[PDB]
């Protein structure tokens with residue numbers, strides 16, 4: 001019936017769960033409960049097509065990342081998330097993309113680079129820097145706030161649109 005399997009990856013605390021929950025459930029999770037591996041499913045219309053989104057929300061914490069690779073293996077597209085006030089999370093993106101390519105055994109995997117927490121003012125990653133990283137990967141860069149919902153739908157729907165280009 002047209003199902004897209006989306007996987008959200010990135011460092012601990014960047015807002016993977018908050019983004020996914022904002023998308024699927026329309027509220028902001030203020031507290032920080034580290035994730036192991038969670039999944040969500042939602043039927044949505046995207047560009048006139050009724051489809052099923054299966055979204056896997058993965059662990060960013062090393063301690064909780066036990067079998068992440070096995071969950072990533074099934075994904076059709078990946079949201080690579082960093083936080084714009086967390087320079088290390090941005091620098092980590094390289095490692096997530098490499099892990100994705102490893103598990104998919106391919107150098108051509110649909111992805112979108114996401115800079116989250118754009119509502120926050122302690123920015124240490126400038127838009128241009130992230131744009132350049134995404135350009136080097138040949139993927140879109142989109143900024144989001146799980147708190148205000150800005151860009152949230154756009155990031156996930158953009159990933160669906162990347163998968164359709166595959």
Ligand SMILES: Nc1nc2c(ncn2[C@@H]2O[C@H](COP(=O)(O)OP(=O)(O)NP(=O)(O)O)[C@@H](O)[C@H]2O)c(=O)[nH]1
Pocket residue numbers: 010011012013014015016017018019029030031032033034035036058059060061116117118119120144145146147148
């Ligand atoms: N201001 C603001 N806070 C955010 C945003 N997204 C997430 N947060 C906050 O950041 C914290 C971590 O969010 P969370 O979604 O749990 O991060 P995670 O990437 O899923 N963590 P983990 O990898 O451990 O599962 C929470 O306190 C959450 O409210 C955002 O866009 N803006």
Ligand SMILES: [Ca+2]
Pocket residue numbers: 027028029030
């Ligand atoms: Ca809340």
Ligand SMILES: [Ca+2]
Pocket residue numbers: 101102103104105
């Ligand atoms: Ca492999």
Ligand SMILES: [Mg+2]
Pocket residue numbers: 016017018033034035057058059060
């Ligand atoms: Mg989480």
Ligand SMILES: [Mg+2]
Pocket residue numbers: 124
């Ligand atoms: Mg700088």
